[PDB]
Design an enzyme around this catalytic site. Structure first.
Site, PDB file in Angstrom:
ATOM      1  N   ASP A 211       9.124 -24.399   3.384  1.00 26.67           N
ATOM      2  CA  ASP A 211       8.911 -25.410   2.378  1.00 26.67           C
ATOM      3  C   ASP A 211       9.056 -24.912   0.935  1.00 26.67           C
ATOM      4  O   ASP A 211       8.935 -23.725   0.690  1.00 26.67           O
ATOM      5  CB  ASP A 211       7.593 -26.175   2.607  1.00 26.67           C
TER       6      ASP A 211
ATOM      7  N   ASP B 201       5.492 -39.864   0.237  1.00 25.51           N
ATOM      8  CA  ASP B 201       4.606 -38.669   0.266  1.00 25.51           C
ATOM      9  C   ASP B 201       5.441 -37.397   0.148  1.00 25.51           C
ATOM     10  O   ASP B 201       5.236 -36.445   0.882  1.00 25.51           O
ATOM     11  CB  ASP B 201       3.795 -38.676   1.572  1.00 25.51           C
TER      12      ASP B 201
ATOM     13  N   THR C  16       4.726 -39.774   7.782  1.00 23.41           N
ATOM     14  CA  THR C  16       3.418 -40.409   8.071  1.00 23.41           C
ATOM     15  C   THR C  16       3.029 -41.568   7.129  1.00 23.41           C
ATOM     16  O   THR C  16       2.259 -42.448   7.535  1.00 23.41           O
ATOM     17  CB  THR C  16       2.268 -39.349   8.204  1.00 23.41           C
TER      18      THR C  16
HETATM   19  O1  LIG Z   1       5.513 -33.550   9.535  1.00 26.95           O
HETATM   20  C1  LIG Z   1       5.819 -32.387   9.706  1.00 26.95           C
HETATM   21  N1  LIG Z   1       5.015 -31.385   9.378  1.00 26.95           N
HETATM   22  C2  LIG Z   1       4.098 -31.455   8.264  1.00 26.95           C
HETATM   23  C3  LIG Z   1       3.237 -30.310   8.387  1.00 26.95           C
HETATM   24  N2  LIG Z   1       3.726 -29.075   7.742  1.00 26.95           N
HETATM   25  C4  LIG Z   1       2.538 -28.251   7.950  1.00 26.95           C
HETATM   26  C5  LIG Z   1       1.447 -28.647   7.020  1.00 26.95           C
HETATM   27  C6  LIG Z   1       2.186 -27.370   6.805  1.00 26.95           C
HETATM   28  C7  LIG Z   1       5.054 -28.412   7.755  1.00 26.95           C
HETATM   29  C8  LIG Z   1       5.113 -27.057   8.488  1.00 26.95           C
HETATM   30  N3  LIG Z   1       6.331 -26.181   8.389  1.00 26.95           N
HETATM   31  C9  LIG Z   1       6.189 -24.939   7.525  1.00 26.95           C
HETATM   32  C10 LIG Z   1       6.961 -25.037   6.203  1.00 26.95           C
HETATM   33  O2  LIG Z   1       6.846 -23.856   5.368  1.00 26.95           O
HETATM   34  C11 LIG Z   1       7.566 -26.491   8.951  1.00 26.95           C
HETATM   35  C12 LIG Z   1       8.622 -25.574   8.948  1.00 26.95           C
HETATM   36  C13 LIG Z   1       9.824 -25.825   9.544  1.00 26.95           C
HETATM   37  N4  LIG Z   1      10.017 -27.047  10.122  1.00 26.95           N
HETATM   38  N5  LIG Z   1      11.194 -27.515  10.723  1.00 26.95           N
HETATM   39  C14 LIG Z   1      10.903 -28.779  11.023  1.00 26.95           C
HETATM   40  C15 LIG Z   1       9.562 -29.167  10.648  1.00 26.95           C
HETATM   41  C16 LIG Z   1       8.968 -28.026  10.067  1.00 26.95           C
HETATM   42  N6  LIG Z   1       7.730 -27.747   9.497  1.00 26.95           N
HETATM   43  C17 LIG Z   1       8.937 -30.476  10.736  1.00 26.95           C
HETATM   44  C18 LIG Z   1       9.727 -31.550  11.124  1.00 26.95           C
HETATM   45  C19 LIG Z   1       9.238 -32.835  11.080  1.00 26.95           C
HETATM   46  C20 LIG Z   1       7.949 -33.072  10.669  1.00 26.95           C
HETATM   47  C21 LIG Z   1       7.137 -32.016  10.279  1.00 26.95           C
HETATM   48  C22 LIG Z   1       7.625 -30.712  10.337  1.00 26.95           C
END
Ligand SMILES: O=C1NCCN(C2CC2)/C=C/N(CCO)c2ccn3ncc(c3n2)-c2cccc1c2
Ligand code: NA
Ligand code: NA
Length: 328
Positions: free
Chosen positions: A141, A179, A219
Site C-alpha cells: 500500500d 473510502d 466495503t
Molecule cells: O479489502 C482489502 N483489504 C483491506 C485490508 N488491508 C489490510 C488492512 C491492512 C490491505 C492489506 N494488504 C497489505 C498492503 O500493504 C494487501 C496487500 C496486497 N493485496 N493484494 C490484494 C489485496 C491486498 N491487500 C486485497 C484485495 C482486495 C481487498 C483487500 C485486499
C-alpha cells in the site's frame, strides 16, 4: 451450500499462508498457488459473537462488497470501458467451520512481530460461516511506500492511474469508491512502460514509471446497473463522521455534505474528494528518494501543486481525466 476451508485452502496452500493485514472486518493472508501469489480476505458472517469489538455482518450486508468486487474486476476484460486499475477477483466462497489451526499459526506470527489490534480468531465453532475472497496480489500500500518512491514523476503516474480507473468505473457503473485512503491504493512493479485504458470507447495510455496501481477495499463503495443500486448505507453511522487528525476524516464529512446524507444517490464528486486527499498525501506526507532538481522535474512538481489547488472545481474523475491540464 457452504464448503470447508480445505476447499479454498488445500493443505499446501494453507501451509504457505502468511498474514499481511487486518481490520475490524477480519483478516488478510497471502499465499501461493501455481507459483503465483494471491491475497485471501476472510470475513466472519451471520454469527452472534462480537468479532474485534463489532457485530458480524449478515449475508445481506456482505453482498455489496462481493458484487462490487466482481464488477470492478470484470472491467479488465471489457471493451468500451476497460481498466486493470482495480484488484482482480479470482473467487468467492462461503465457508463453514472453525478457524484452521494453520491460519492461527500465521495469525500468531504476525501478532508477535507486528502486533495485532484484533482478537485471536480461535473462538469460532464448527458451524461458523465465513466469506473467503481470493484476490490477485496487488503489492504494497501507498502508506507503506511513504519513503520508498523514486520521485514526484512516480506520484504523477500514480495519480493519473487512479484518476483513469475511477473515470472508467464512473462511466461503466456510476461507481464511487467512498473510502480511498492511502491504505487502499496498492503498488506493484511492472515491466510495462505504458498502461492502457479505454473510456467510452476511446483508448489511451499512461506512462507507468515502473508501477501498476490497484485500488482495493469496496466495503463503503457504491455502483449501479440498470437502476439497481448497490451500496453501504452509512446514513445512521455516527463514528464514521467524527474522526480527527488526518484530512481522511474530513473526506467522510465532506461526502455527507455533498450527498445530503443520501448514500443511494450518485455523487461522483466523492471520487474527486478522495483524489484530492491522495494528492494532498503526495505533496505533504510522501517523501521521495530524489527531490525535484532538474527543470523538467520542477515542472512536474508545479503541475501537481496546480492540480491540488484546482481539482476540487471538477465534477467527477471523468471530468478530471478528460479536462485537467495535468493529463495532457
Ligand atoms: O479489502 C482489502 N483489504 C483491506 C485490508 N488491508 C489490510 C488492512 C491492512 C490491505 C492489506 N494488504 C497489505 C498492503 O500493504 C494487501 C496487500 C496486497 N493485496 N493484494 C490484494 C489485496 C491486498 N491487500 C486485497 C484485495 C482486495 C481487498 C483487500 C485486499
Ligand atoms: Na470452488
Ligand atoms: Na520530502
Amino acid at each position: 451450500g457452504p464448503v470447508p476451508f480445505s476447499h479454498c485452502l488445500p493443505t499446501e496452500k494453507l501451509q504457505r499462508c502468511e498474514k499481511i493485514g487486518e481490520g475490524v472486518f477480519g483478516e488478510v493472508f497471502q499465499t501461493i498457488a501455481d507459483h503465483t501469489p494471491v491475497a485471501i480476505k476472510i470475513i466472519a458472517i451471520e454469527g452472534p459473537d462480537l468479532v474485534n469489538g463489532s457485530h458480524q455482518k449478515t449475508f445481506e450486508e456482505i453482498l455489496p462488497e462481493i458484487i462490487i468486487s466482481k464488477e470492478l474486476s470484470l472491467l479488465s476484460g471489457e471493451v468500451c470501458n476497460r481498466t486493470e486499475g482495480f484488484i482482480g477477483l479470482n473467487s468467492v466462497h462461503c465457508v463453514q467451520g472453525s478457524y484452521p489451526p494453520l491460519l492461527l499459526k500465521a495469525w500468531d506470527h504476525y501478532n508477535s512481530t507486528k502486533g495485532s489490534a484484533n482478537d485471536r480468531p480461535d473462538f469460532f465453532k464448527d458451524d461458523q460461516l465465513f466469506i473467503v475472497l481470493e484476490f490477485e496480489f496487488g503489492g504494497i500500500d501507498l502508506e507503506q511506500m511513504r519513503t520508498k518512491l523514486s520521485s514526484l514523476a512516480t506520484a504523477k503516474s500514480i495519480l493519473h492511474q487512479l484518476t483513469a480507473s475511477l473515470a472508467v468505473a464512473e462511466a461503466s457503473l456510476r461507481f464511487e469508491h467512498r473510502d480511498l485512503h492511502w491504505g487502499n491504493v496498492l503498488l506493484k512493479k511492472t515491466s510495462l512502460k505504458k498502461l492502457h485504458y479505454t473510456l467510452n470507447g476511446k483508448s489511451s495510455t499512461i506512462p507507468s514509471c515502473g508501477l501498476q496501481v490497484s485500488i482495493i477495499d469496496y466495503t463503503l463503495s457504491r455502483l449501479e446497473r440498470d437502476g439497481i443500486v448497490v451500496f453501504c448505507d452509512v446514513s445512521m453511522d455516527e463514528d464514521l463522521f467524527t474522526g480527527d487528525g488526518d484530512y481522511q476524516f474530513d473526506i467522510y464529512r465532506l461526502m455527507k455534505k455533498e450527498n445530503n446524507n443520501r448514500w443511494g444517490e450518485y455523487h461522483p464528486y466523492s471520487n474527486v474528494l478522495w483524489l484530492h486527499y491522495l494528492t494532498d498525501k503526495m505533496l505533504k506526507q510522501m517523501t521521495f528518494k530524489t527531490k525535484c532538481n532538474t527543470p523538467a522535474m520542477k515542472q512536474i512538481k508545479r503541475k501537481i501543486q496546480e492540480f491540488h489547488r484546482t481539482m476540487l472545481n471538477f465534477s467527477s474523475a471523468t471530468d478530471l481525466l478528460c479536462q485537467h491540464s495535468l493529463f495532457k
